[PDB]
Amino acid sequence: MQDGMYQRFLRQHVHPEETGGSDRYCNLMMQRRKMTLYHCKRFNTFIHEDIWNIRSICSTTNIQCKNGKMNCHEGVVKVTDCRDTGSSRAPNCRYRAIASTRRVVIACEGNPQVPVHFDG
Numbered sequence: 001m002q003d004g005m006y007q008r009f010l011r012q013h014v015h016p017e018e019t020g021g022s023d024r025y026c027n028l029m030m031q032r033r034k035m036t037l038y039h040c041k042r043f044n045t046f047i048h049e050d051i052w053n054i055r056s057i058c059s060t061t062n063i064q065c066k067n068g069k070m071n072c073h074e075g076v077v078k079v080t081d082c083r084d085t086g087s088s089r090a091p092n093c094r095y096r097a098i099a100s101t102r103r104v105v106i107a108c109e110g111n112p113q114v115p116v117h118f119d120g
């Protein structure tokens with residue numbers, strides 16, 4: 001399950017080669033990554049850092065998740081937050097982008113540890 005949840009976390013939140021930062025990027029990416037298939041996912045973060053840098057976050061000290069578990073970690077990374085505008089429905093979803101280098105919190109599971117969920 002951690003291997004299927006890990007690939008999904010990959011499809012949904014990672015893009016190291018690019019640096020997005022625009023609505024147009026959010027509109028393209030959200031669709032290339034299959035998140036507007038049936039409904040316009042409300043909010044989504046794309047991390048623009050090397051995969052090994054995201055795995056390296058799992059090793060930081062442990063902190064509480066929004067759910068109460070303690071298998072969560074934090075790191076300051078470059079991201080592009082994609083916010084649905086609410087205008088149109090799938091498959092034509094339109095997004096608003098926001099760039100910043102900010103603090104993200106992900107959940108890691110398994111052995112070796114891998115990111116399986118984006119807390120916030």
Ligand SMILES: O=c1ccn([C@H]2C[C@H](OP(=O)(O)O)[C@@H](CO)O2)c(=O)[nH]1
Nearest residue numbers: 012043044045046081117118119120
């Ligand atoms: O900064 C944020 C906040 C939330 N989410 C997504 C992740 C979760 O859905 P997901 O597991 O399907 O990615 C959900 C609640 O955090 O919103 C992001 O992508 N970025």
